Amino acid sequence: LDNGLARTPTMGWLHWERFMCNLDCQEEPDSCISEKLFMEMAELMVSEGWKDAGYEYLCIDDCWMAPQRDSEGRLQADPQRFPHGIRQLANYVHSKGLKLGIYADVGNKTCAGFPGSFGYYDIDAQTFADWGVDLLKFDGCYCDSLENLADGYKHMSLALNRTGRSIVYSCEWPLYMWPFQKPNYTEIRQYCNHWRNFADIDDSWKSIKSILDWTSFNQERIVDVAGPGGWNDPDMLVIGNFGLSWNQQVTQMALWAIMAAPLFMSNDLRHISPQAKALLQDKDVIAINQDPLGKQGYQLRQGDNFEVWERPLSGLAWAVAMINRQEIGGPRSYTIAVASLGKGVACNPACFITQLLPVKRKLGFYEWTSRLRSHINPTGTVLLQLENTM
Amino acid sequence: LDNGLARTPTMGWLHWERFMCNLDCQEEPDSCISEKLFMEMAELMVSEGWKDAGYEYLCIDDCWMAPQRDSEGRLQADPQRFPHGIRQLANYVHSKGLKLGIYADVGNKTCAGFPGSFGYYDIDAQTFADWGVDLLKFDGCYCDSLENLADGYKHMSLALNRTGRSIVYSCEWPLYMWPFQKPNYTEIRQYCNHWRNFADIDDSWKSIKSILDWTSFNQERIVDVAGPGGWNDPDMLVIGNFGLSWNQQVTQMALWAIMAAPLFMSNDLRHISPQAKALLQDKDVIAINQDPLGKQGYQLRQGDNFEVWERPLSGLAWAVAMINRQEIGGPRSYTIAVASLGKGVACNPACFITQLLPVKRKLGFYEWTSRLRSHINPTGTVLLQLENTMQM
Ligand SMILES: *[C@@H]1O[C@H](CO)[C@@H](O[C@@H]2O[C@H](CO)[C@@H](O[C@@H]3O[C@H](CO)[C@@H](O)[C@H](O[C@H]4O[C@H](CO)[C@@H](O)[C@H](O)[C@@H]4O)[C@@H]3O)[C@H](O)[C@H]2NC(C)=O)[C@H](O)[C@H]1NC(C)=O
Ligand SMILES: *[C@@H]1O[C@H](CO)[C@@H](O[C@@H]2O[C@H](CO)[C@@H](O)[C@H](O)[C@H]2NC(C)=O)[C@H](O)[C@H]1NC(C)=O
Ligand SMILES: *[C@@H]1O[C@H](CO)[C@@H](O[C@@H]2O[C@H](CO)[C@@H](O)[C@H](O)[C@H]2NC(C)=O)[C@H](O)[C@H]1NC(C)=O
Ligand SMILES: *[C@@H]1O[C@H](CO)[C@@H](O)[C@H](O)[C@H]1NC(C)=O
Ligand SMILES: *[C@@H]1O[C@H](CO)[C@@H](O)[C@H](O)[C@H]1NC(C)=O
Ligand SMILES: NC[C@H]1N[C@H](CO)[C@H](O)[C@@H]1O
Ligand SMILES: NC[C@H]1N[C@H](CO)[C@H](O)[C@@H]1O
């Protein structure tokens, strides 16, 4: 989408995975989907260094709406859970230097059953712009035809444009097309700043494996379309929650950097371990994810329960990730000729290699003839940056 | 097995899950199966508090043997990886106050392809006894006849008996029966101190779930068989390795306590986080696992992606574990009438409830009519101890 936005993958926080559709503010005031939850997350995004690290968009997912539209047929936030309304929440979020994301659905209802936007695309776009919304996640539930799906996503894209406000447009279009018809990613990128390709992530290593495996299986179709203004979205970062071991969290961070993925955390910023916070705020890894060239990485190799992924960066640098998919035993040795990396240019005539994950360690100079040797933890990842000596 | 051993579930360390069959001591010296590894592991078991916590058996799994038997037809340790031999390793282990476990196979070869014990049961038992072995893990590979399997396990049990040395006898008999017919656990318990029921564990939450689900599915068949001298073995503790989140590690520790399981760690004691070590050395949870009553726990309830397990303890106490199997979202509230716990006996007329996991916290007195309310993390477990009481 050539709206001047998302020139690097969008970074921020999205409530869905950790907080979902919790409406029980009477029994669970601190966890329910409410204005107070987003105020608390905004405060911590400022005070705990998230904004400084680049996490900029505080995003509302499903279950913010009132059961019905208002007198004039516009969407409204739930009166009890969002007493001051979305425009006021956006004002607050802006006063902190952050941006606000909101959620709507292309069909007749949202996935959780709240008012859909079909028939209201232009009014909804104008409502969002009037409210000061900075990002829209547009879901695909309750849409009875591929034509309605495509037409709605394009119509909403154009309506957002017509409001004149800069609004990041996040689409689930491909995900809802894939069971029936192969998506045309050139068209999608024409209309969207990023697009969900695959099933919702949850708090599990199985989910991560399945997302990585889908991305590597389909990489010939999706890798080259990505770039400044339009990214593949493999769904939220779930680092800092409950289901991932430390090495599995490292794998998610490293490979979301390799994939030039949007970095939408879905966690509780009020209760997050120092280790998870340091991983999610890792300057060098974020810098890889945010590389201005915006060329998505890809899987280079797979075999012996090892995977090698790599990503070209600005200024002749490369990022390389090595995953150990064997879920038994101990750290496993993996070696690869550096001439096999970076299409044969990264280390010609030589390169300096720095390991970034699981810990930052300079590895030294590697000549064109050299072999890179590493030990990779089960379900963990070794992430490296290669700098050509020219 | 009525050998006076394993009156509580055996506790120790077994190399299989973490170190497997790594034979490459030149390229992977720190991971290969060698005498130096077991010597160092013994030193750390002493110095890092593992022996004090109750972990007593340092156990060798597969891939310790030389490719062939010796001139006298007895087994021998690998010449390069175990130059000083099993007798000397056992001397070292005993000098640290620990006990040594070893591995053999009922069939013609071990699962990794090394000499099997079939045809040599009595001499192999005697060899182990001469070496000073204190525990035998007896595998079931390369034995495709049910009669051979059963006869071999019984024979090895009797042969170990004849040596006159006290040796814990750990069997994989039931697991190897399933391709043919489901086991008679009365017979197995007659011959074994504990027995593997289900597929090998690996370093994953998937594996933990599958072991728990098999145990609860088959619990009417295996729970009452267990007791002092004979335990169900759901395989090694893998806390301290790589594939389990903190809450998944807590779930494994809590439920291995519930199940009266042998506690065999399979990790690297040289590289283990403080948090994992504190969990594995948790005095109160170990005390649940080691409860002298020796009655295995069971799944009480299951529904809405929640599980409730409980285990009766000595002196009218109970352990209760609540698992959240929903792998999305945040901590989920679960409430239960305390009268539903411990068969209505734990809290009659009252009980004092102490949460032990994920953190230790006194919850207070709960009267027989009261309700217990708790919050459980995704893939985590809340482990509680109920003490029957007449007071407030
Ligand atoms: C080879 O097999 C034989 C037969 O199975 C086995 O002999 C058995 O040894 C056990 C353990 O020593 C004996 O059990 C003991 O019996 C005495 C006398 O009745 C009791 O006083 C003992 O009670 C104490 O220990 C128990 C734990 O075992 C506790 O439950 C109890 O509270 C006491 O602390 C204990 O019951 C058993 O009687 C014999 N059986 C026979 C038939 O002789 C022998 O040990 C095996 N070989 C080797 C090397 O162990
Ligand atoms: C509406 O769409 C137009 C057309 O794509 C966008 O115009 C582009 O804006 C970028 C950034 O300002 C320029 O670099 C391009 O040259 C423009 N292209 C064209 C064809 O005009 C415009 O930014 C969009 N406006 C909003 C508010 O989204
Ligand atoms: C995928 O969609 C793109 C964009 O809608 C199609 O490309 C356009 O094709 C028309 C007609 O040939 C050209 O005039 C435009 O210049 C193209 N637009 C762009 C942005 O390239 C493309 O044909 C579609 N591909 C398939 C296989 O259907
Ligand atoms: C919404 O419902 C109407 C009436 O049932 C239907 O005609 C229309 O196609 C639906 N729209 C979508 C996108 O499913
Ligand atoms: C199980 O084994 C015991 C002891 O050997 C024996 O007495 C019993 O009959 C067996 N049960 C069945 C059902 O075969
Ligand atoms: N992919 C389906 C989408 N619908 C849910 C909201 O109800 C989340 O936004 C999820 O990402
Ligand atoms: N269940 C199969 C058994 N065989 C392996 C050794 O090769 C492990 O001991 C495992 O416990």
Numbering used by the authors:
A (entry chain A): 32 to 421
B (entry chain B): 32 to 423
Sentences from the paper on this structure:
α-Galactosidase A (α-Gal A, EC 3.2.1.22) is a lysosomal glycosidase that hydrolyzes the terminal α-linked galactoside present on macromolecules such as globotriaosylceramide (Gb3).1,2 Mutations in the α-galactosidase A gene (GLA) are found in patients with Fabry disease (FD), one of the most common lysosomal storage diseases (LSDs), which is characterized by the progressive accumulation of Gb3 in cells. The bindings are primarily stabilized not only by hydrogen bonds (H-bonds) between the hydroxyl groups of the compounds and the residues D92, D93, L168, D170, E203, R227, and D231 of α-Gal A but also by a salt bridge between the endocyclic amino group (endo-N) of the monobasic compounds (pKa ∼ 7.0) and D170 of the enzyme at pH 7.2.
Previously, the dibasic iminosugar and potent α-Gal A inhibitor 5 having the (2R,3R,4S,5R) configuration pattern demonstrated good chaperoning activity in cells transiently transfected with various mutant α-Gal A.23 Notably, iminosugar 5 exhibited superior pH-dependence in its inhibitory activity compared to its monobasic parent molecule, 4, suggesting that it binds to α-Gal A at pH 7.0 more effectively than 4, leading to better enzyme-stabilizing or chaperoning activity. Surprisingly, in the compound 5-bound structure of α-Gal A, the positively charged exocyclic amino group (exo-N, pKa = 9.1) of 5 forms bifurcated salt bridges (BSBs) with residues E203 and D231 of the enzyme at pH 7.2, where the carboxylic side chains are essentially deprotonated and negatively charged. By contrast, the corresponding C-2 hydroxyl group of 4 forms H-bonds alone to E203 and D231 at pH 7.2. This finding most likely reflects the stronger binding affinity and better protecting effects of 5 toward α-Gal A at pH 7.2 compared to those of 4. In contrast, the titration curves revealed that the endo-N moiety in compound 5 exhibits reduced basicity (pKa = 5.5) compared to that of 4 (pKa = 7.0) due to electrostatic repulsion between the vicinal ammonium cations,34 which implies the formation of an H-bond between endo-N of 5 and D170 at pH 7.0 but a salt bridge at pH 4.5.
